[PDB]
């Protein structure tokens, strides 16, 4: 027939890695460091580098078992290899931060089970296998819980107690993938935050990179340069926070995401000219792109301030998440966020007042604090906006009644 | 091959509209009013009518931008048009209920982004775009939050703070659609009630109409005349409440749903002979169909009363929803519902008692109030049903212990 | 084309039944009893047997209506038949445990609606029909709620107030099924525990058996012998608890699951040589297989004890479920479970201490009770593990601070 064709399911990958066929490739490049693998026919070597030299010294390994998957954190180095006709699939952990004399452990998966993806969390490690199993391990080598995956894994990321799994929930058509996300919190109270929700992607695009921001919010990038971030303040939906194609000059130009930071806001990525991944040598330079939510009429003052407001809102939801889970957060960052947002609301209200859009001013005042609304009332008494001042006063009464 | 064939995904639509190819078509017909579009080669006009003349005067617009999507509420008129080679896709709002002198605003979507569906809520508006984005706007023109859709939108509806999105979650086979529902509450505490649950449809049918009842419960109709309603009292499942094919006399006869009302119960729709949608002229007459849940042996007294009981139960769940969300509800309606249900239970218990089904009587008494159970005990002492009276007494003891 | 092919959706089935084409087949074989159907051209008979003769006497029925689906519980016998050109699809219940003189009821489904699956709960019965409807009935014959199914049903099971539905959520490819699970609790507070989550299956396998353990935990088996159980302590994920292929000697050997028991742990199944289901005559013998979670390096002492620990953890989650839902549970079973787990942790800590893996000892002590940690501190003071004793002491301080 001549209709829709099933899209081939994309293969699993480690975020921040370059393809396996390269002689000198990146196994992982994140906010902790870089892991490179030089593999020809004579020898196979793995080199580990840390951005902060104080964390650990540079580590060089002789890749005898031919490790093809790697992840790096401030605690350990995680390595994995598939099975051969003689050896089993192995998970290798270099626990360099351990305070004891045993800084290494390795485990063999059962017969005919191959590791397809790994990720490192805070004090734990996870491995998705060809048996549609997810195996949890402590950073010291204890086997934790095991559960089955609803489909073949695509990529896996970890941060703190959070586990971020993207897998094939179905079969897409006409170039589209059919991906689902399983988001778990592996603390003392186990929670499945997302029960295989559909992962939004740009049409005819595939998954290019997943992970967490340094502050601990799940994020991912598709092959069309669209960067999306979990919106905890919007029912755990996914909000686009950047479009790396706006910084590209041609079709063959791409950006290779390395890390995401919310405070200060910066998207650390490698500019790539001619391909989607940078060559290992010479050392590529990390670029810093700004985040921009895809808002309408962003060239106008209204659209510009509206984008700044909602970007400030979503990039400070992590403070509430750190508070709800007992983590440590700076109360000063929370206060600066509110002041930054109340200033943008006040400037947007003054703009709507100049445009004789007084109903819009009351809508903006609904997002304001009680102090900001009281200030907007006196600004409305000024400039002879008498009815607007009355509507704002009635809004201030309603806000005080909500307490 | 000769097997299952992929079903073509149905295109987005506005509920209560007639096809675009008509010279004189309905853009939207709901419980607020009617919006018609007359478009030939000479001129293009849009006419707005309100069922209640006291709400607003009849509005006539010169459709210069060729708006093809429309929605209507007691607050504003929402219009949208796709992009051309010279103009961008635009969202136009006629805020006629505004108390200020600015009763109009329009916004341009970014390049190559087209509006595919719109809907109006209480004080807000939403637009699903070709970029798989959902854009939220206040009724006054402020851009609110934005998040990505898991698939191409099919239809969109709003009521109060609720957002009702139906989209393609996959690809169906053999005439079946693969639809998912995302139900959000956009109040001060954002909630995603349904994380893309599968939307039940009749086999080989497509989505024909979605929306909310006047009381605020999500409902939808498929192409086979099956009307389904969210059952908040049954874990947010979907319960069939009507079958418009029972009122049709032939295959070519159809009913075109306009609105759904829970108190009093009535399904307002347009009878259509020969097609699925009514012609614009002459003005079609609104028919009132009754709701009937698809219960077994409904011709018998037992099945008839069982259908009346569960229809009364599901059509009063909205009272609990209005109470939990601080909305205003009549306590008298809640009391009349319970009295209506306790009377049906009492008549079903008397029927089971006549049939010497005393175990069934105790099952019916489990659904009764403590006062109704006490009354059933004295009715069981009467007519010499001594063991039944003892079982009902032990049930009354258990009910008092649950407090 | 030459690519992925759509997998034909498997047909609905009753768990514990043998195919319909057999002259003498099992309609259901569970922990309550056996129901056999002998059907040739001369006569059609249904025989009911109870494992405990004290429950009820053996029942013999003349299958005049040609019932093809059956389920059995300690309360009633449930039978169902499809519709013919003269008769409707019927649901027949033999309420043998009733304390009244009416121990039978039957109901007719509407025109062109056929029963596809049934299941028995505590005091209720459910039937999934060809109209994509789920109909609830009390054990005495009262019609309860009705809601629509997101797809064609595959199998259905019930236990207490829990309803376990597996259905087709999509179309799989290359031999894979696309199954979803809807898990409901039908008590006085209706809950949808699983909103159509994807059902994990072994690749290229189909669903072979579903049901609940005697303690009330959902479980299911695929065609590759993998037995999975709901992990309530792991965010309602699914954990493999057995692999019946490890007990098979050849490809043609299979195990036919009958029941699952958590305390004592035993998987009751019928060994089958040459086919997937046992012949009705002679009476097959019920085998008892042990549960084994698929852990790595299970031949070693570490892997063996780690498997025993997590098997003990998951097979005692039902005690917490019985407690949260007011059911009756033995506090002695909960105490024996903790003692069994603290002993395994203590032996694993002593093993890690012998291997000079002191960081791993602290990880194991995190899973210990406060008394077990205090004991591990004195064991660390012994054998001159001074730093380990300090780390365990700081862990004991942190545990006391969590109260």
Numbering used by the authors:
A (entry chain A), B (entry chain A), C (entry chain A): 421 to 823
Publication text:
Ctf4 orthologues have been identified in various eukaryotic organisms, including fission yeast (Mcl1), Drosophila (Ctf4) and humans (acidic and nucleoplasmic DNA-binding protein; AND-1), suggesting that its functional role has been conserved throughout evolution. AND-1 clearly shares some or possibly all the functions of its yeast counterpart in maintaining genome stability and establishing sister chromatid cohesion. This is a likely consequence of its sequence similarity with Ctf4 (21% identity and 36% similarity over 722 out of 1129 aligned residues) and their shared domain structure, comprising an N-terminal β-propeller domain and a C-terminal SepB domain, the latter being responsible for trimerization and for interactions with proteins harbouring a Ctf4-interacting peptide (CIP) motif. Here, we show that the SepB domain of AND-1 is a structural orthologue of yeast Ctf4, that it exists in a trimeric form and that it binds to Pol α/primase, like its yeast orthologue Ctf4.
To investigate further the structural basis for the interaction of AND-1 with Pol α, we determined the crystal structure of amino acids 329–826 of human AND-1, comprising its SepB domain, which correspond to the region of Ctf4 (Ctf4CTD) that we had previously characterized. Despite the low sequence identity (17%, based on structure superposition), the AND-1 SepB structure bears a remarkable resemblance to that of yeast Ctf4CTD, with the same tertiary structure comprising a six-bladed β-propeller fused to a C-terminal bundle of five α-helices, and an RMSD value of 1.8 Å over 305 Cα positions. In the AND-1 structure, the trimeric arrangement of protomers seen for Ctf4 arises from crystallographic symmetry, and it was confirmed by size-exclusion chromatography multi-angle laser light scattering measurements. Indeed, inspection of the putative binding site for its client proteins, based on structural homology with the Ctf4CTD structure, highlights a solvent-exposed hydrophobic patch formed by M766, A770, A792, L795 and Y799. The pulldown experiments showed a clear interaction of Pol α148–171 with AND-1336–826, which was not observed for the double alanine mutant. Together, these findings indicate that AND-1336–826 is a structural and oligomeric analogue of Ctf4CTD, and that it interacts with its client protein Pol α using the same molecular mechanism. The resulting dissociation constant of 39 µM showed that the interaction of AND-1 with Pol α CIP is surprisingly weak, and prompted us to ask whether other regions of AND-1 and Pol α/primase contribute to their reciprocal association. Crystals of AND-1 329–826 were grown at 9 mg ml−1 using the hanging-drop vapour diffusion technique, in 0.1 MHEPES pH 7.0, 1.1 M di-sodium malonate and 0.5% (v/v) Jeffamine ED-2003, supplemented with 0.36–0.42 M sulfobetaine NDSB-195. The protein crystallized in the cubic space group F 4 3 2 with unit cell dimensions of a = b = c = 249.72 Å and one AND-1 protomer per asymmetric unit.
